[PDB]
Amino acid sequence: PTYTPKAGDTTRSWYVIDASDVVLGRLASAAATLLRGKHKPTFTPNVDGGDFVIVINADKIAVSGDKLTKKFAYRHSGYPGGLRKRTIGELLEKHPTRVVENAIIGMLPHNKLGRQIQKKLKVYAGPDHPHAAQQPIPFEIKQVAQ
Amino acid sequence: AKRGRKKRDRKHSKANHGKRPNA
Amino acid sequence: ARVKRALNAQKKRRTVLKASKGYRGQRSRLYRKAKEQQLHSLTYAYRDRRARKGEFRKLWISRINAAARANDITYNRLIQGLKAAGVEVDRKNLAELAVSDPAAFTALVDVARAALPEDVNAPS
Amino acid sequence: TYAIVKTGGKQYKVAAGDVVKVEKLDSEPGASVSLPVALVVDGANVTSKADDLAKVAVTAEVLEHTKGPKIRIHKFKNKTGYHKRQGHRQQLTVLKVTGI
Amino acid sequence: AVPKRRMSRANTRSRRAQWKAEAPGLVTVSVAGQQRKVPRRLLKAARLGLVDLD
RNA sequence: UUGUGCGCCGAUAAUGUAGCGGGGCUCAAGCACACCGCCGAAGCCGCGGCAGCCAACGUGUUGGCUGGGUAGGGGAGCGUCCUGCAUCCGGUGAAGCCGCCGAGUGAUCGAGUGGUGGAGGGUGUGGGAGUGAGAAUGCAGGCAUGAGUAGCGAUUAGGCAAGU
RNA sequence: GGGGAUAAGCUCCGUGCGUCGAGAGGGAAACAGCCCAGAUCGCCGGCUAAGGCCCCUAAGCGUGUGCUAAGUGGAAAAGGAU
RNA sequence: UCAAACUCCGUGAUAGCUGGUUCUCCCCGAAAUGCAUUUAGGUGCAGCGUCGCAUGUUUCUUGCCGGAGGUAGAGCUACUGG
RNA sequence: GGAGGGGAGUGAAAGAGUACCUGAAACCGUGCGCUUACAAUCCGUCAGAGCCCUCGACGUGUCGUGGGGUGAUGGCGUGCCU
């Protein structure tokens, strides 16, 4: 019958993306695709078999509209009146990694497997990374004609 | 007020074709 | 004339409670609680028997599409092409090919490339 | 080396020896039966056109007629009083691909 | 007040497993040529001949 | 100055974003008009098994149509007890109980075998019913959760040595 | 169409109109009456409807020509405005 | 325990009232409307269901011909009124 | 200390000991295998990794027209009756 990956089956890879003025949505959808594993033919939703992702120049992310300063990230401690919010600009100039992370985390399942996937997501505010000893494959986001 | 209106306005969707039960 | 009722009940009790070895709590000990869960259980089995078809077909399609897109063609146009070419292979088996032998699948991809219309968005 | 047989309103990937279960065909345990084909593979290349595919046919041996798994149905609806019990085993016919 | 439900097997046995006991930490004593095991709290009183050793 | 297609302000409530389902989207992933494909249901088709109505034929075969269903009407059946009649097993171990392996479209079944156990049971045809319970703030007995928790019955107050 | 304020998930009548009741499944974010469609049982087979194809969610960040700058889309009036 | 004790009996009182009513499959399958009613939450008959017999397409659908209507609409020096 | 019990015995059998034919379920525990302490669960179902037991064809361990217990993880899913 149909094929189901066993234990000694997975083959991993470390991909690396540039965020040089890429659109956040494109970038995040691509990363979600890769991490969840919708690009290999061995896909199975019960298994995590995607690929590690390394994002760089994440402080170069540039969005459209007034979303830099009219858009409001929110949180809530749980206490009363403990709703506190932030723009996107403030949040870049505080820590840029979180914008791209949360953007991607909303493009994944919020289940156990999703939590076990977020482990496979590494993001760095600069161009660099300590993960050169995996020789990361550059990914260039492309669109297939039909 | 709000609740009734949002009901009566969710009805104008596309998969309902302009109508819903109990408005 | 008086008919004690013991046997005639014990029968179905034994049946049910044999069929609920794996349930967790009062669903695994007690007839009035396992009967209910048997109703729900057989029903959910029925429904899943009707729907695992769509489940597997979804799976097969995701595999096919990812394989193709790594060979730089979309799913929709692949199936347009095979329909045009009269090729008969179903999706379970296209997926099996994708897993095992990507070469043959790439050959089929190439067939569809050949057999598609020239101007796909034409008004024909 | 393998092929893809059509039968039962279904399809099955096969090669010689690969035992298979299908719907109830009409034969005796031990007899042989031929079958149509959709795809064939000799190594790397493919036979994918209908004329060649009608010219090719696979041959199989009926090992044994058989009965599938027992399937319990208890249709049910609430506040109503509607139970309906029912059961099923589907008749099968095991094939063994002799050659191609 | 009064409970509302029949608190399950898991929870029941789980909390019930806190009602346990520990053993006193025992220590030898050379009670007149031979040895017996006694807590440390009572060691001197044993060596002086008060503890009822049965 | 007319008529139009999208737009702006007016716009404004109380647990927490909160009048896209969310991320996010104008480098449309938004509106309109045409075009191409595709996914998608227990629908239709495809391969198989059962069933009801009718029809054709032959000493029960096939075919077409049909088969959601509560109140309810009608039809056909399993099971339990006692019995009339005929036969079968039974201290070389029945029943009953725990099972394993299997069966039936279902109520259910094992003359299929193991353990325990110790004396009545099965089969076919008919007869008769105290004839099938999951619910009646249902009855009787037994046992759980609460729980190893609250309390241990006053406002007088107990103690040390020795004793068996 | 009446009563009501030409208000009510209001009330009262009509209708070889519908569905629910007694009707599952798919879509509608969840949602007895809305749209599709009326479940004999099985299959790890195929084609379609309503609806939809950036990720979550299987399917198109589809093709062509124009508009939108308002996060309109993804509530709203009288009226105001190069 | 007293706006008329308690016990046995009549007595298994009676309730247009509440609850409960046990094994399976097969076929067909509703209604929530009308008149009356010390009556409106109940019931009787008609309505819609099935079973059996009878009558055989009389039912239903589409087309064509024949018939009365005073609705929407419009009209008013064609009447009654503004 | 005694209750009570272990051997030795009776007995066809003490899984017949004066709490005694058989001796169910709830319920109460002891061992053996799997699983469970970053997770939101009408408590199941469909797919299913991994481990443990078993039957059989073979070969120094090994897939199978297998079967059974557990079952990470994913999708679907709003108790029973009146």
PDB file of N, CA and C in Angstrom, chain E residues 9-28:
ATOM      1  N   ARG E   9     -10.696   8.242  38.695  1.00  0.00           N
ATOM      2  CA  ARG E   9      -9.755   7.270  39.205  1.00  0.00           C
ATOM      3  C   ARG E   9      -8.353   7.828  39.223  1.00  0.00           C
ATOM      4  N   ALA E  10      -7.987   8.530  38.164  1.00  0.00           N
ATOM      5  CA  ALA E  10      -6.639   9.042  38.035  1.00  0.00           C
ATOM      6  C   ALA E  10      -6.321  10.012  39.144  1.00  0.00           C
ATOM      7  N   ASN E  11      -7.136  11.047  39.255  1.00  0.00           N
ATOM      8  CA  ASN E  11      -6.928  12.090  40.237  1.00  0.00           C
ATOM      9  C   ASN E  11      -6.964  11.526  41.640  1.00  0.00           C
ATOM     10  N   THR E  12      -7.997  10.731  41.912  1.00  0.00           N
ATOM     11  CA  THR E  12      -8.143  10.047  43.183  1.00  0.00           C
ATOM     12  C   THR E  12      -6.876   9.309  43.594  1.00  0.00           C
ATOM     13  N   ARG E  13      -6.456   8.322  42.806  1.00  0.00           N
ATOM     14  CA  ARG E  13      -5.294   7.538  43.190  1.00  0.00           C
ATOM     15  C   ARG E  13      -4.038   8.391  43.222  1.00  0.00           C
ATOM     16  N   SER E  14      -3.990   9.433  42.400  1.00  0.00           N
ATOM     17  CA  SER E  14      -2.813  10.271  42.329  1.00  0.00           C
ATOM     18  C   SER E  14      -2.560  11.007  43.624  1.00  0.00           C
ATOM     19  N   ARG E  15      -3.589  11.697  44.118  1.00  0.00           N
ATOM     20  CA  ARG E  15      -3.502  12.436  45.377  1.00  0.00           C
ATOM     21  C   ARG E  15      -3.377  11.455  46.528  1.00  0.00           C
ATOM     22  N   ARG E  16      -4.072  10.328  46.434  1.00  0.00           N
ATOM     23  CA  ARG E  16      -3.987   9.331  47.477  1.00  0.00           C
ATOM     24  C   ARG E  16      -2.561   8.860  47.654  1.00  0.00           C
ATOM     25  N   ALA E  17      -1.773   8.905  46.596  1.00  0.00           N
ATOM     26  CA  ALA E  17      -0.393   8.479  46.681  1.00  0.00           C
ATOM     27  C   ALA E  17       0.516   9.479  47.369  1.00  0.00           C
ATOM     28  N   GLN E  18       0.011  10.635  47.778  1.00  0.00           N
ATOM     29  CA  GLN E  18       0.777  11.522  48.640  1.00  0.00           C
ATOM     30  C   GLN E  18       0.677  11.126  50.101  1.00  0.00           C
ATOM     31  N   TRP E  19      -0.389  10.436  50.489  1.00  0.00           N
ATOM     32  CA  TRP E  19      -0.552   9.989  51.863  1.00  0.00           C
ATOM     33  C   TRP E  19       0.274   8.734  51.998  1.00  0.00           C
ATOM     34  N   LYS E  20       1.529   8.937  52.360  1.00  0.00           N
ATOM     35  CA  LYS E  20       2.519   7.883  52.386  1.00  0.00           C
ATOM     36  C   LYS E  20       3.199   7.894  53.737  1.00  0.00           C
ATOM     37  N   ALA E  21       4.309   7.178  53.842  1.00  0.00           N
ATOM     38  CA  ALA E  21       5.097   7.161  55.056  1.00  0.00           C
ATOM     39  C   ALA E  21       6.562   7.041  54.684  1.00  0.00           C
ATOM     40  N   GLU E  22       7.408   7.645  55.508  1.00  0.00           N
ATOM     41  CA  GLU E  22       8.845   7.459  55.427  1.00  0.00           C
ATOM     42  C   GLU E  22       9.324   6.647  56.614  1.00  0.00           C
ATOM     43  N   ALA E  23      10.479   6.031  56.436  1.00  0.00           N
ATOM     44  CA  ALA E  23      11.073   5.186  57.444  1.00  0.00           C
ATOM     45  C   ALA E  23      12.141   5.953  58.202  1.00  0.00           C
ATOM     46  N   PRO E  24      12.280   5.753  59.512  1.00  0.00           N
ATOM     47  CA  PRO E  24      13.355   6.434  60.235  1.00  0.00           C
ATOM     48  C   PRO E  24      14.711   5.906  59.799  1.00  0.00           C
ATOM     49  N   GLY E  25      15.706   6.781  59.825  1.00  0.00           N
ATOM     50  CA  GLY E  25      17.034   6.417  59.401  1.00  0.00           C
ATOM     51  C   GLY E  25      17.752   5.663  60.489  1.00  0.00           C
ATOM     52  N   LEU E  26      18.022   4.387  60.247  1.00  0.00           N
ATOM     53  CA  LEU E  26      18.448   3.487  61.297  1.00  0.00           C
ATOM     54  C   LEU E  26      19.958   3.369  61.358  1.00  0.00           C
ATOM     55  N   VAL E  27      20.429   2.948  62.522  1.00  0.00           N
ATOM     56  CA  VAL E  27      21.840   2.944  62.867  1.00  0.00           C
ATOM     57  C   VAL E  27      22.087   1.807  63.839  1.00  0.00           C
ATOM     58  N   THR E  28      23.264   1.199  63.741  1.00  0.00           N
ATOM     59  CA  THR E  28      23.599   0.080  64.599  1.00  0.00           C
ATOM     60  C   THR E  28      23.837   0.543  66.024  1.00  0.00           C
TER      61      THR E  28
END
